[PDB]
Amino acid sequence: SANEDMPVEKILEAELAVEPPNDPVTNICQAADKQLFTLVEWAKRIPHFSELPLDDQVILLRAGWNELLIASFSHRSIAVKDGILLATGLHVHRNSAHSAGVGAIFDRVLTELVSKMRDMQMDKTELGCLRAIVLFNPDSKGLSNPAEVEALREKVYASLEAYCKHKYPEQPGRFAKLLLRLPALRSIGLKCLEHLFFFKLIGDTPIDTFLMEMLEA
Amino acid sequence: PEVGELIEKVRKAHQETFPALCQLGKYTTQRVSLDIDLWDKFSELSTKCIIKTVEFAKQLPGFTTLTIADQITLLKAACLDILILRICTRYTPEQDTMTFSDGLTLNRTQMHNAGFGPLTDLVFAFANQLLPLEMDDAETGLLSAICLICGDRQDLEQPDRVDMLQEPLLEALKVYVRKRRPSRPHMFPKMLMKITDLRSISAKGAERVITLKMEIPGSMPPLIQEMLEN
Ligand SMILES: CC1(C)CC[C@H](c2cnc3ccccc3c2)c2cc(C(=O)Nc3ccc(C(=O)O)cc3)ccc21
């Protein structure tokens, strides 16, 4: 009954829901603002996210927004060859990333995220669970009841591993192989936060305040 | 079966290159920027532990069958991960202390002044977060090995091949962890994903290291390359 606590099918519903002046920095910023305007829509369709207190909802979203977007545009970029497919439809390539001062991040996204998801054929369901795991992060500081949050996260572990045993029985170590993208995702997500000063997301509006107004909406 | 051999090899590799907290005779000696004396003892043990971590690596099945460059690349990059993980399995929550491989036991302020500095509370929080896991020699060893044989590391000559070495390790951890904890299989992903917290700490740790190679002249000479050159 693992899939009943945290339904795979409802998680993919959340992914499929929020799935989508021209210069590098502008292109990245506007791609970020777009996906930012719809995380709250995504998280709301994650099982039991809405049943959490509203102050906890804000915290979890402000804690993983960058890493939720990176995971999402990395998997989306499996199509593109040697580049990033932004949520706005634009293709960003190495030089364009160097122009934006994020060439090293670009290279890491390609080798540690896109290539790995490509070679193991990570489907959108597993990406969704990975993002749900990122969402239900119990270390998020200020959380009112973290025990509920990692009870929720562990339900995603249970569902995801159940799904992997089901759809890929010939690959017993596939659940672990998926999880091993999460350290890379965290590593890369940290480096991106170093560039926030150059990428004005929203009208310099505090990310915190933005999500809350989306939630109390 | 053949996985139990792997578990036993990895446990033996860990046990020989890193003794457990409980079998170790302890000895001992406010917050400041850096206690240079503690730093000397701390830096002198960290060097020994590096050497032991290389010994541990060469004991891992099929590690030395990598390109000697990729061997260097992997050890050079998982280096702090294993040090930080190892010392955190020597944490004593009663005394809020950590014990080194010679018995040296420092408390939180001493760990801070020894070189942990602003990273002190991160590391100590990570060690506390390990206590509920109740990890033993085999599990600590496996987690280290999984952390070392990482195909994500850049400049790898045979990245796919490292990925192959890592797979039997991920299986071993899964079955071993869940056998000892039959009513709560979430402990396996919970233990793997500690690597995520470990990378973060280690990343900031690499910040700390460059600051100290300059503020402490002639500190931390490179030494993984050349020992592995032989
Ligand atoms: C906070 C930070 C990053 C500061 C730099 C320092 C370090 C790292 N490498 C060194 C290499 C050579 C000399 C000194 C060094 C000091 C370093 C080392 C560690 C660490 O676990 N060291 C460590 C771990 C285990 C043992 C032992 O089992 O006896 C001894 C030392 C943890 C954090 C840091």
Ligand SMILES: CCCCCCCC/C=C\CCCCCCCC(=O)O
């Ligand atoms: C192409 C490499 C990307 C690196 C971006 C670094 C910028 C750091 C600032 C904010 C992080 C936002 C990352 C981009 C989000 C794009 C969303 C999308 O297209 O799905």
